[PDB]
Design an enzyme around this catalytic site. Structure first.
Site, PDB file in Angstrom:
ATOM      1  CD  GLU A 176       7.336 -46.338 -24.193  1.00  0.00           C
ATOM      2  OE1 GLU A 176       8.332 -48.279 -24.245  1.00  0.00           O
ATOM      3  OE2 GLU A 176       6.971 -46.450 -22.869  1.00  0.00           O
ATOM      4  CD  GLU A 364       3.042 -46.293 -22.496  1.00  0.00           C
ATOM      5  OE1 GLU A 364       3.136 -46.455 -22.019  1.00  0.00           O
ATOM      6  OE2 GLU A 364       2.955 -46.800 -24.270  1.00  0.00           O
TER       7      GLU A 364
END
Ligand SMILES: [Br-]
Ligand SMILES: [Br-]
Ligand SMILES: [Br-]
Ligand SMILES: [Br-]
Ligand SMILES: [Br-]
Ligand SMILES: [Br-]
Ligand SMILES: [Br-]
Ligand SMILES: [Br-]
Ligand SMILES: [Br-]
Ligand SMILES: [Br-]
EC number: 3.2.1.86
Lengths: 466, 464
Positions: A176, A364
């Site tokens: 991320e 995810e």
């Protein structure tokens, strides 16, 4: 009819520092999260200078994946995982980050983990940096602000690519990586890059410098992996929160468009291999000055990632005049205010694929919710099944209908893990319940939630039985 | 202090069949528009089997650019055009389309026009096919539905590419190639490709077959131009109407995202070089069988366009055509929603998608013009529109960083409208004295926007 590809990578995802524990076992050094105290609603986590005996650090123990991994993996195999995504704890390989040699005991640990995984035919998916760099690198070098950290990360990557060149097919560099684009937030910069930007004279310039060092480190890693074993695939990892314009007001539509660049700049560089003109223009306007070494730009073009890994949880809505967003009145949200928008998944998939035309990986996805252990020991998490099922439906649509190239799907915290924002257990994501609580009680044992057998059937029917 | 590039290509844009006239002069053969009658509000233009005596054909005379080009160009130079966009009338070069040799007269005509343009330092921007293909190709071969037309079009491109390899730097293959994606509408299919899709047993399948031939033709033309003079830029031409999701409802957003593919599929193929997976999937869904030849996919990959030319006039908002009026914008008296920000949006989206040079080859405001007692035409309304758009355009270039070649407003000299074929709906800086009722003497005069735009170019966009 049409179905997902037969070799679709159904699995589950976690991060080392969020499940392993054993924070100081096997020669592992402290990471930035080992000095990150636990928090709660309205009570932020605290960064401490060293490990204070009076403080609570949830990542120290987590769910003890370090000790339970063989048995947990047996549970993953029971669900029939095609793959498993975790991270290699940077601090288990280079406890301080600048050692002359790697930590052999750390390398052995992951040899054993990947061996078990492969024993059940489970392909490891490994994130190189997942919010857990060595404390020493931050304290001694000023962290990613220092070009030396580039070298340290590449040494780290080089050691692991070679060690597991025949055990790991799928890699990602920086988890991320775009979280920190929000530079005012207390912990995105810290967990991403061990840098709190508002504590610098030029927070934003400092941000772009860190980003540059990380883009270059990512590109250097891609090349390293290509030389060691070009069969391996190294992808980037983008936190994908799509932004809808609140209305068809041109100002709203245009604001969302420009705002999406906060996401896209990262994949633009890591996938296209150069800074997009729109970000270079900003540097001019703001008069930023980002130190580069000769060859950096070449490195970027030559070391672009191979696939686009991303997390999806929710969608946001934005107004040109107002706020820095505003809740979408067309969608419901979890108990933590995370908006539930399955269609947003198809949107994200279509948008990302049409922009880059490279393979995508959903590494995810999941629903953070409270779980109640019933009298008989069952955990009925239909709320989580409803969430995942709706997303899988939309995901299927983007693949079979829209023609998106999708590698696989790995729901987050497939076994209960320590949360990111608060470092709590109570906000659960897992198919596997872990008996560990916010007040420290529990025996750390595992048990199957109702979502366990459901996700089992999902994989067995390649996503046709939901 | 930031501004547009010093070499920004300001200009004006028209189409041969909408301005030239002299439809049967200089050996020119009849085009699809030479049999398209004039119309009006609530009265569709009609396609006739052939040229019928008692029928009105606006394109036959147009505004007589054929006779006025030299003098018209002088007016272009007075505003200080850096470039001028028009099309080469396919039928002046191959009157019927399948001739083995080009029509010398047709060729010389454009030598003259281009020589005049270049006399004033005006760079020609030439659209190969602009709603004006030879009638004969349609009647005899069944138009673009026939693979033979690919070679006919390429023969055409090759002739003109060679003839003007030192006069024309900027080309485009097919004008607003995506207009026909709306296969139901009566004119788009016919004007784009001389095919009315609803008149076929498989309208949509027929459409994709037509498109494949034109994609190949475009690519073959690009490859041909590269061999003739690799310095020449051959671009595509997309009609760009951005589609906004009406609300933040995920369904509106998604619907809008998928709908935009009706535009992007055309630039995806012509710029990226291959059929995007989403359209290939639709074909399997619908059972379509698009007939291809060996090497076609190779041709598409080898002959991608250099830059993205596009037209912009408006935006639509969509709700899960599915259009609904956008309550945040005004509109022209013809219903076209005015949305300058939409231009900036179009520029950023197109650029971020392909990272290829863009070119605004059309942008305009169609509206009535009144001649005042003293001969002046006060078109404040038109200036207003143009200025608001230029402003957002500048932002896309200097703020957002979009790579933009130039900007040529549509119907820079009053021309015959597309939908109705009327004169009353004017776009130009230059007024032409000719009316829907046929009255007028074809004389030119300057509107208020003439000197206004003149100053825009002189100030390179810094004085609006
Ligand atoms: Br402290
Ligand atoms: Br050492
Ligand atoms: Br709890
Ligand atoms: Br015939
Ligand atoms: Br029509
Ligand atoms: Br059909
Ligand atoms: Br082929
Ligand atoms: Br539409
Ligand atoms: Br600006
Ligand atoms: Br009139």
């Amino acid at each position: 009819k049409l179905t997902l590809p037969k070799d679709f990578l159904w699995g589950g995802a976690v991060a080392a520092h969020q499940v392993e524990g054993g924070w100081n076992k096997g020669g592992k050094g402290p990471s930035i999260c080992d000095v990150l105290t636990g928090g709660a609603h309205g009570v932020p986590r605290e960064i401490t200078k060293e490990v204070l005996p009076g403080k609570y650090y949830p990542n120290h123990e987590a769910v003890d994946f370090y000790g339970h991994y063989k048995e947990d993996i047996k549970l993953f195999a029971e669900m029939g995982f095609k793959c498993f995504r975790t991270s290699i704890a940077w601090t288990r390989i280079f406890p301080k980050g600048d050692e002359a040699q790697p930590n052999e005991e750390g390398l052995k640990f992951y040899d054993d983990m990947f061996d078990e995984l492969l024993k059940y035919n489970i392909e490891p998916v490994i994130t190189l940096s997942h919010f857990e760099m060595p404390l020493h690198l931050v304290q001694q070098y000023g962290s990613w602000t220092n070009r030396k950290v580039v070298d340290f990360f590449v040494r780290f990557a080089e050691v692991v690519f070679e060690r597991y060149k025949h055990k790991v097919k799928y890699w990602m560099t920086f988890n991320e990586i775009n979280n920190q684009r929000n530079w005012r937030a207390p912990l995105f910069g810290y967990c991403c890059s061990g840098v709190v930007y508002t504590e610098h004279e030029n927070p934003e310039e400092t941000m772009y410098q860190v980003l540059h060092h990380q883009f270059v480190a990512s590109a250097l890693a891609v090349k390293a992996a290509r030389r060691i074993n070009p069969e391996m695939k190294v992808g980037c990892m983008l936190a994908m929160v799509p932004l809808y314009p609140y209305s068809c007001n041109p100002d709203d539509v245009m604001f969302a468009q420009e705002s999406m660049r906060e996401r896209y700049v990262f994949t633009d560089v890591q996938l296209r291999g150069y800074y997009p003109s729109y970000v270079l223009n900003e540097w001019e306007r703001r008069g930023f000055n980002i130190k580069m070494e000769d060859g950096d730009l070449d490195v970027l073009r030559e070391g672009t990632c191979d696939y686009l890994g991303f997390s999806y949880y929710m969608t946001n809505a934005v107004k040109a005049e107002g706020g820095g967003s505003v809740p979408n009145p067309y969608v419901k949200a979890s108990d933590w205010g995370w908006q539930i928008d399955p269609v947003g998944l198809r949107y994200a998939l279509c948008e990302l694929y049409e922009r880059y035309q490279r393979p995508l990986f959903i590494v995810e996805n999941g629903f953070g919710a409270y779980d109640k252990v019933e009298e008989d020991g069952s955990i009925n998490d239909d709320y989580r099944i409803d969430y995942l099922r709706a997303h899988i439906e939309e995901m299927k649509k983007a693949v079979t209908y829209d023609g998106v190239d999708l590698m696989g799907y790995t729901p987050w915290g497939c076994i209960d893990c320590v949360s990111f924002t608060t470092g709590q257990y109570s906000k659960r994501y897992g198919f596997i319940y872990v008996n560990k609580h916010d007040d420290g009680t529990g025996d750390m044992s595992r048990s199957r939630k109702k979502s366990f057998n459901w996700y089992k059937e999902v994989i067995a029917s390649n996503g046709e039985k939901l």
